[PDB]
Structure 1
Amino acid sequence: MKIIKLYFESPVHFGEKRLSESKITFSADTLFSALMIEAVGLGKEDEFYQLASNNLVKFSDAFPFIDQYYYIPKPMFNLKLEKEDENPSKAFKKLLYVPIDSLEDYLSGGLDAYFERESFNLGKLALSEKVQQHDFKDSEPYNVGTFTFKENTGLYVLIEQTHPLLEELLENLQYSGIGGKRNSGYGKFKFEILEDSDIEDLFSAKGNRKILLSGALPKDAELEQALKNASYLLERRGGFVQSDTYATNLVKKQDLYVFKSGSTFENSFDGDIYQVGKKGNHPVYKYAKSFFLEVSV
């Protein structure tokens, strides 16, 4: 609908559990954490939480885009309707991201397996050997896993009904970086809200199977409804609370397990914004609302 295209001017660290490795995309909870930190910066975190918790600003995570080819993580189809031909094997296993316009072609079969992966080339992971210099003690060598994008390549975020407050927050997020070592020379980007036309048709479509496009956790009421004929995958969303005004020390947060952003469901559920920091003096939130892409097998 409103593809937010992020163009990075420096390698990024989007780490999953440790500093030595980086991954190529950031999730929607990472982006909501960044925007909430910005909103606390300019004093309107309450309105941002109200907007996001009232579904007025719901977004997917960051997917790759290459030369105006919007990519999506390989949807978790049950592949019950492809054993007749093609390769129902590890051929469709190294394939990580498929284009979002060619999903119905992929879903019905006929998309090349080998061709896509070499076609899908956006930069490469990098080592960044660093140290903590000590005058008389020994220096502390550490490395930061980073990732540099190509020239005409970056990440894109699906947002429904962009908001003036969200536009104000994304301007502030340009100059504070996104990702791991952003205060070091890594997090840096410029964005374009970039309304799009061939994409809004995919989300105005209909179909039996729904593709989850944001790492989401169902409410306790609809977990049973969503966990029926579903092909999902959990992932722990924890780590350390990034704030200088929380718990007067460096404390971890309650690990949250959410459905991955490639899972497929027959029942649409609306996730929740989860309180994962309670013992501290501000609400640490895990954005886990649901963003879907309905298809028909």
Structure 2
Amino acid sequence: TYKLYIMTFQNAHFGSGTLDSSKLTFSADRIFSALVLEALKMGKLDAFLAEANQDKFTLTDAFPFQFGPFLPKPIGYPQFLALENVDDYLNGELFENEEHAVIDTVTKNQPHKDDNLYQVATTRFSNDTSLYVIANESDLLNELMSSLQYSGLGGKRSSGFGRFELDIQNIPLELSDRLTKNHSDKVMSLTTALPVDADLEEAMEDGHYLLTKSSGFAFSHATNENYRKQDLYKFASGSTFSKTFEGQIVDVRPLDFPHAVLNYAKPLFFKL
């Protein structure tokens, strides 16, 4: 709400459902699960969840940062837009997407083995592009993300991916004025949110979203076996709505599991 972070990667894998395909942003439950796995170690996640369950805790997925903050294309009412261009895009002439990251793909190996060729895609950022989560300024979050500097984000992360440099900044105005979370007019979820149920019936009627399917494993220390998550369909970073809704933190534990698998989907919005 109050303080945009800055992640400067220069090497990152961000998943997309495979290893052969990566994506240049990372869909806010990834950064929230990174913080949960960073507060599970240095054991602190009870404080981070008593903070996180509050309505003070907002969090927001990454958008590019090339000399200024970007926002998604709002889906409907005629790919990213700088904040200077969003009002001109709601008139809409041409805002063709420049290069933020080049998505390379490299074949790798496990030498002297039998089915050993895997292929890792990689967003290689173009020497100025950063990714900027927007979250509420809090010291616990700063101790968490200043060590996610050195643990990394997203992909392989122990083979040298997703490792950044955090450069916490104030939010520039005309982007702080339009983060609302309780509005009643033409609004845009710049997170990937999942509404509460009756609130979701309120959400579907004139919401212009994508769906995008957050899924596809639980990272644990208590199974010695990899169990699939509960395959959560969500909304997109575009996803215009009317009458701003209220999201969840959807427990997607693979049933009969020792702990919770949280999958942050509650929205910070953008007025338009």
TM-score, with length taken from structure 1: 0.85
**Which residue in 1 is equivalent to 2:37?**
37
**Contact 1:70–1:101 (CA<8 Å) still a contact in 2?**
no
State the number of aligned residues. 268
Correspondence 1:44-123 to 2 at 5 A: 44-66=44-66, 68-79=67-78, 96-109=79-92, 111-113=93-95, 116-117=96-97, 120-123=98-101
How big is each residue's C-alpha offset from its partner over 1:178-211, in whole Å with a ceiling of 9 and x where there is no partner? 0111111112101122013322133369772100
The amino acid that maps onto 1:2 is K
| Max Rg structure | 1
Structure 2 residue 134 is the aligned partner of structure 1 residue 158: yes
**Contact 1:238–1:255 (CA<8 Å) still a contact in 2?**
yes
Identity %: 39
Give the stretch that moved more between structures: 202-211 or 279-288: 202-211
The amino acid that maps onto 1:105 is D
Question: Which sections of structure 2, spanning at least 5 residues, go unmatched?
Answer: none
The amino acid that maps onto 2:84 is D
Give the stretch that moved more between structures: 46-55 or 16-25: 46-55
Following TM superposition, the consecutive aligned residue runs of length 4 or more in structure 1 with deviations greater than 2 angstroms are 196-199, 201-208
The amino acid that maps onto 2:208 is S
Q: C-alpha distance in 2, partners of 1:293/1:215?
A: 13
- Picking from 169, 185, 210, the partner of 2:160 is 185
Structure 2 residue 179 is the aligned partner of structure 1 residue 203: yes
Q: C-alpha distance in 2, partners of 1:204/1:263?
A: 15
Q: C-alpha distance in 1, partners of 2:180/2:71?
A: 17
Q: C-alpha distance in 2, partners of 1:196/1:72?
A: 13
Q: C-alpha distance in 2, partners of 1:282/1:204?
A: 33
Distance 1:201 1:185, change over 3 A: same
**Which residue in 2 is equivalent to 1:268?**
244
The amino acid that maps onto 1:75 is P
**Which residue in 2 is equivalent to 1:2?**
3
**Contact 2:77–2:90 (CA<8 Å) still a contact in 1?**
no
Distance 1:176 1:210, change over 3 A: same
- Which is strand-richer, 1 or 2? 1
Q: C-alpha distance in 2, partners of 1:252/1:239?
A: 6
Distance 1:139 1:133, change over 3 A: farther
**Which residue in 1 is equivalent to 2:116?**
140
**Which residue in 1 is equivalent to 2:218?**
241
What's the Cα RMSD here?
A: 1.8
**Which residue in 1 is equivalent to 2:266?**
289
Q: CA deviation at 1:69?
A: 2.8
Q: C-alpha distance in 2, partners of 1:204/1:218?
A: 16
Q: CA deviation at 1:294?
A: 1.3
- Picking from 143, 148, 161, the partner of 1:173 is 148
Q: CA deviation at 1:139?
A: 6.3
**Contact 2:180–2:268 (CA<8 Å) still a contact in 1?**
no
Q: C-alpha distance in 2, partners of 1:194/1:102?
A: 21
**Contact 1:231–1:263 (CA<8 Å) still a contact in 2?**
yes
TM-score, with length taken from structure 2: 0.93
Q: C-alpha distance in 1, partners of 2:71/2:172?
A: 17
The amino acid that maps onto 1:269 is F
The amino acid that maps onto 1:71 is F
